[PDB]
Design an enzyme around this catalytic site. Structure first.
Site, PDB file in Angstrom:
ATOM      1  N   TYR B 451      -1.153  -3.884  14.234  1.00  0.00           N
ATOM      2  CA  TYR B 451      -2.152  -3.211  13.132  1.00  0.00           C
ATOM      3  C   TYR B 451      -3.455  -3.747  13.334  1.00  0.00           C
ATOM      4  O   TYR B 451      -4.076  -2.666  13.780  1.00  0.00           O
ATOM      5  CB  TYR B 451      -1.368  -3.665  11.619  1.00  0.00           C
ATOM      6  CG  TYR B 451      -1.750  -2.842  10.420  1.00  0.00           C
ATOM      7  CD1 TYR B 451      -1.352  -1.718  10.142  1.00  0.00           C
ATOM      8  CD2 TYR B 451      -2.674  -3.633   9.485  1.00  0.00           C
ATOM      9  CE1 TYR B 451      -1.811  -1.099   8.953  1.00  0.00           C
ATOM     10  CE2 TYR B 451      -3.145  -3.035   8.606  1.00  0.00           C
ATOM     11  CZ  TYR B 451      -2.754  -1.629   7.929  1.00  0.00           C
ATOM     12  OH  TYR B 451      -3.241  -1.327   7.258  1.00  0.00           O
ATOM     13  N   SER B 532      -1.297   4.060  10.010  1.00  0.00           N
ATOM     14  CA  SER B 532      -2.690   3.619   9.341  1.00  0.00           C
ATOM     15  C   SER B 532      -3.797   3.089  10.032  1.00  0.00           C
ATOM     16  O   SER B 532      -4.267   3.737  11.064  1.00  0.00           O
ATOM     17  CB  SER B 532      -2.194   2.951   8.158  1.00  0.00           C
ATOM     18  OG  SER B 532      -3.241   3.049   7.025  1.00  0.00           O
ATOM     19  N   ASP B 623      -0.516  13.665   2.386  1.00  0.00           N
ATOM     20  CA  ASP B 623      -0.678  12.373   2.574  1.00  0.00           C
ATOM     21  C   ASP B 623      -2.286  12.279   1.663  1.00  0.00           C
ATOM     22  O   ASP B 623      -3.299  12.657   2.201  1.00  0.00           O
ATOM     23  CB  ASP B 623      -1.230  11.995   4.077  1.00  0.00           C
ATOM     24  CG  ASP B 623      -0.647  10.479   4.224  1.00  0.00           C
ATOM     25  OD1 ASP B 623      -1.287   9.805   3.279  1.00  0.00           O
ATOM     26  OD2 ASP B 623      -0.550  10.098   5.130  1.00  0.00           O
ATOM     27  N   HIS B 665       2.753   9.809   1.936  1.00  0.00           N
ATOM     28  CA  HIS B 665       2.537   8.427   2.558  1.00  0.00           C
ATOM     29  C   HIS B 665       3.324   7.544   2.047  1.00  0.00           C
ATOM     30  O   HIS B 665       4.316   6.859   2.827  1.00  0.00           O
ATOM     31  CB  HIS B 665       0.904   7.811   2.327  1.00  0.00           C
ATOM     32  CG  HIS B 665       0.696   6.684   3.109  1.00  0.00           C
ATOM     33  ND1 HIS B 665       0.147   6.838   4.206  1.00  0.00           N
ATOM     34  CD2 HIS B 665       0.766   5.335   2.836  1.00  0.00           C
ATOM     35  CE1 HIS B 665      -0.099   5.364   4.657  1.00  0.00           C
ATOM     36  NE2 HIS B 665       0.124   4.836   3.754  1.00  0.00           N
TER      37      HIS B 665
HETATM   38  C1  LIG Z   1      -3.732   2.107   5.991  1.00  0.00           C
HETATM   39  O1  LIG Z   1      -3.790   1.081   6.719  1.00  0.00           O
HETATM   40  C2  LIG Z   1      -4.743   2.622   5.197  1.00  0.00           C
HETATM   41  C3  LIG Z   1      -6.162   3.236   6.092  1.00  0.00           C
HETATM   42  C4  LIG Z   1      -6.944   1.864   6.175  1.00  0.00           C
HETATM   43  C5  LIG Z   1      -6.718   0.861   5.246  1.00  0.00           C
HETATM   44  N1  LIG Z   1      -5.270   1.678   4.472  1.00  0.00           N
HETATM   45  C6  LIG Z   1      -4.866   0.911   3.625  1.00  0.00           C
HETATM   46  O2  LIG Z   1      -3.885   1.848   3.232  1.00  0.00           O
HETATM   47  C7  LIG Z   1      -5.351  -0.059   2.728  1.00  0.00           C
HETATM   48  C8  LIG Z   1      -5.251  -1.415   3.598  1.00  0.00           C
HETATM   49  C9  LIG Z   1      -3.896  -2.011   2.953  1.00  0.00           C
HETATM   50  C10 LIG Z   1      -3.639  -1.374   1.282  1.00  0.00           C
HETATM   51  N2  LIG Z   1      -4.795  -0.321   1.515  1.00  0.00           N
HETATM   52  C11 LIG Z   1      -4.828   0.677   0.389  1.00  0.00           C
HETATM   53  O3  LIG Z   1      -4.769   1.614   0.502  1.00  0.00           O
HETATM   54  O4  LIG Z   1      -4.864   0.015  -0.963  1.00  0.00           O
HETATM   55  C12 LIG Z   1      -6.206   0.231  -1.566  1.00  0.00           C
HETATM   56  C13 LIG Z   1      -6.064   0.274  -3.261  1.00  0.00           C
HETATM   57  C14 LIG Z   1      -5.702   1.546  -3.648  1.00  0.00           C
HETATM   58  C15 LIG Z   1      -6.021   1.436  -5.155  1.00  0.00           C
HETATM   59  C16 LIG Z   1      -6.077   0.398  -5.854  1.00  0.00           C
HETATM   60  C17 LIG Z   1      -6.112  -0.872  -5.067  1.00  0.00           C
HETATM   61  C18 LIG Z   1      -6.155  -0.893  -3.925  1.00  0.00           C
END
Ligand SMILES: *C(=O)[C@@H]1CCCN1C(=O)[C@@H]1CCCN1C(=O)OCc1ccccc1
Ligand SMILES: [Ca+2]
Lengths: 6, 693
Positions: B451, B532, B623, B665
């Site tokens: 990752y 991701s 997604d 997703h």
């Molecule tokens: C997958 O890795 C994607 C693409 C880049 C980072 N990411 C995420 O999904 C990030 C990383 C871990 C959690 N994340 C996420 O989407 O949560 C963010 C979030 C959204 C809404 C409220 C609080 C935090």
């Protein structure tokens, strides 16, 4: 809480 | 390969540098051109996958191996015990209640009765008295939820319906009158919902219109006296801490806010572990990249004191007050967990239990519980729920539930951890699972997973399809704990982020080089997988070292690093990646941005016999996190640059996309999940020219 460990 | 229109007029000037975006039109998912695109790519994918004759064999073994019952970790409210259950192949886990730990379970809510189990339970929460169960139902394919509330006595619903909730939990007050939650307006907010009222009556506690992109988590203390509101900024491990004393409200919460702002900056992370009146114990990464535990009194909030100090080596991943006056610390020590039992008051060490390779988690015991439960899993250990009764038998961990994989002998296989050197000398931990006593003769097909960002720790948990790969494809599996993760604290994170994002890819490339040289596999018998930020990892690595890999599988990955910040919730990843709006940071990104770095490797001198590995790009059409345009534009770019731009291209390896219809997703049904994995393993088997066993 994922349905299965695939 | 199907024809794909280029729009040769789209060009942007990033700080003197012209960057064309010929496939900009794929950013509209509703244009019939895009819809047709998808339809064609789907057609192509199936065409190729029909050629992959092992898919059906993998699929059956994956089903057969997944088909065993699974109890989740139980937690307690009053004198009831709740937990999740799956008979084996139910599309989603079912939430259940019981009066006795080994009494008859009762089904409380079953997601499989709704949209055939397309979505399971994301948010679930039981009142202190165990009478009410507030849970979250996804309405459509979207991330949005509706909170509903059941009485547990008869499984009947309250009329209460709370719309516009995303990731909020429901935090019950000890009077059982209501809960806190964190909804969006029809700019996140903190609200309190009284039972039997309409959402329109819910009390306001926090908003900050001046900072629309700050978001929230929250929590109540075990004694029920304080409401804490945590305020975050992006995905950085850091937060504010505001406390509300509920004992001092003239009129309960119906008055209505006057928060004690104990931490009013984003300097560091803070997670309340316990408290004794006004005297809190927090977990923090303040002046401590591995974390530590610290103690403060709210009535003299300037004076903070170390309770359990930072370790020189080991990450303090989490902490839990248990058994009235004890602490369970969960340390991550060279990517292997270690549990410590300490005195809450003094912070003094009482017992220490190192865990085998694998992962413990899901410790949900509360401070007033004397029996702790947690889940252990591993590559060859499917799932065990352990219990420890700290009152009457503190030394011994006893087995409470134990999953068994049908017709699988775990003694045929082994798992090592070794450390390998990266380009810059840094050692990188990697796990390696394979059959016992294989020859290190270069033959074996090899899957490698990683990752590398956002503080996320990659543990080596149980996958059933991994076993199939291992047993029936004579395979060797590797999980790489590269930088960008949090495995070794916050410096390990920062060593693979922003300007040092490249170290993440060098670390991965280095692990693969180790596997080749040590004799596990060979160049072009190596498969890489990631999702991701791990999809970005896969995609940048094949751009940079296509010669090293035979097959590559990038799931819902982030590919246009110039424009990711513009869509859905990509704006909260600029902490980790950068933003192309700033020249200095644009210069990081343009180097690894997967769509802007697709080059024909055979045109490099000395590298003529080389091509891109067989590549599958997986994504949902709907997604909402990593918008699928990323996956598409890359797919488009790769197909053009490597195939459709040339009369008779040396690129003979397929480049395709597996596009999941009508999924998100999040939370995927068991059989949807199996269908995908069966597809990606059959593909991989063909790309590596690997036979079945
Ligand atoms: C997958 O890795 C994607 C693409 C880049 C980072 N990411 C995420 O999904 C990030 C990383 C871990 C959690 N994340 C996420 O989407 O949560 C963010 C979030 C959204 C809404 C409220 C609080 C935090
Ligand atoms: Ca090949």
């Amino acid at each position: 809480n994922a349905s299965a460990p695939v | 390969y199907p024809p794909v229109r280029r729009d040769e007029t789209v060009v942007d000037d990033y700080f003197g540098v012209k960057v064309a975006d010929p496939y900009r039109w794929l950013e509209d998912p509703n244009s019939e051109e895009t819809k047709e695109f998808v339809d064609n790519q789907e057609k192509l994918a199936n065409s190729v996958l029909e050629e992959c004759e092992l898919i059906d064999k993998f699929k059956q073994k994956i089903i057969d191996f997944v088909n065993f019952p699974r109890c989740g970790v139980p937690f307690r409210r009053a004198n009831k015990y709740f937990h999740f259950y799956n008979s084996g192949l139910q599309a989603q886990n079912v939430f259940q209640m019981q009066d006795d730990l080994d009494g008859k379970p009762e089904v409380l809510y079953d997601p499989n009765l709704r949209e055939g189990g397309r979505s399971g339970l994301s948010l679930y929460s039981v009142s202190e008295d165990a009478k009410y169960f507030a849970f979250g139902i996804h309405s459509g394919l979207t991330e949005w939820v509706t909170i509903k509330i059941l009485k547990t006595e008869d499984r009947s619903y309250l009329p209460d319906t709370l719309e516009w909730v995303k990731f909020s939990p429901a935090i019950w007050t000890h009077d059982n009158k209501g809960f806190f939650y964190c909804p969006y307006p029809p700019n996140q907010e903190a609200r309190y919902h009284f039972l039997g009222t309409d959402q329109s009556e819910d009390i306001l506690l926090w908003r900050d219109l001046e900072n629309p992109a700050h978001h929230l988590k929250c929590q109540i203390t075990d004694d029920g006296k304080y409401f804490l509101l945590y305020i975050l900024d992006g995905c950085d491990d850091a937060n504010k801490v505001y406390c509300l004393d509920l004992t001092k409200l003239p009129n309960g919460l119906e008055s209505f806010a006057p928060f004690m702002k104990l931490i009013d900056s984003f300097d560091a992370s803070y997670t309340a572990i316990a408290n004794d009146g006004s005297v809190f114990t927090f977990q923090t990464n303040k002046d401590a990249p591995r974390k530590k535990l610290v103690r403060v009194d709210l009535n003299n909030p300037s004076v903070w004191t170390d309770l359990v100090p930072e370790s020189k080596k080991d990450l303090l991943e989490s902490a839990h007050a248990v058994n009235e006056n004890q602490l369970i610390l969960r340390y991550l020590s060279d990517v292997k967990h270690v549990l410590e039992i300490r005195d809450l008051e003094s912070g003094a060490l009482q017992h220490r239990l190192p865990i085998d390779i694998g992962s413990v988690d899901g410790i949900t015991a509360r401070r007033r519980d004397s029996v702790v439960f947690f889940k252990f899993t591993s590559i060859l250990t499917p799932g065990i729920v352990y219990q420890c009764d700290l009152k009457n038998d503190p030394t011994q961990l006893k087995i409470f539930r134990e999953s068994v994989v049908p017709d699988f002998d775990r003694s045929e296989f082994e798992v090592k951890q070794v450390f390998v050197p990266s380009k810059d000398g840094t050692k990188i931990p990697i796990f390696i699972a394979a059959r016992k006593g294989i020859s290190l003769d270069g033959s074996h097909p090899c899957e490698m997973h990683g990752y590398g960002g956002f503080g996320i720790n990659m543990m080596p948990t149980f996958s059933a399809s991994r076993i199939v790969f291992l047993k029936h494809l004579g395979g060797v599996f590797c999980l790489a704990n590269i930088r960008g993760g949090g495995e070794y604290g916050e410096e390990w994170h920062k060593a693979g982020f922003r300007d040092k994002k490249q170290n993440v890819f060098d670390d991965f490339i280095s692990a693969a080089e180790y596997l080749i040289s040590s004799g596990y596999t060979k160049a072009r018998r190596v498969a890489i997988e990631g999702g991701s930020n791990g999809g970005l990892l896969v995609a940048a690595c094949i751009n940079q070292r296509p010669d090293l890999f035979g097959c590559a599988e990038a799931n819902c990955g982030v590919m246009d690093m110039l424009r990711f910040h513009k869509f859905t919730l990509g704006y909260l990843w600029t902490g980790d990646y950068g933003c192309s709006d700033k020249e200095e940071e644009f210069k990081w990104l343009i180097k690894y941005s997967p769509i802007h770095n697709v080059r024909r490797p055979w045109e490099q001198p000395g590298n003529e016999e080389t091509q891109y590995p067989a590549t599958m790009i997986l994504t949902a059409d709907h997604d909402d996190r990593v918008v699928p345009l990323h996956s598409f534009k890359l797919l488009a770019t790769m197909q053009h640059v490597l195939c459709t731009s040339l009369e008779d291209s040396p690129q003979k390896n397929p480049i395709i996309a597996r596009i999941q219809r009508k999924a998100a997703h999040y939370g995927r049904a068991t059989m949807t999940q199996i269908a995908e994995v069966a597809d990606r393993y059959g593909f991989m088997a063909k790309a590596l020219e690997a036979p079945w066993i």
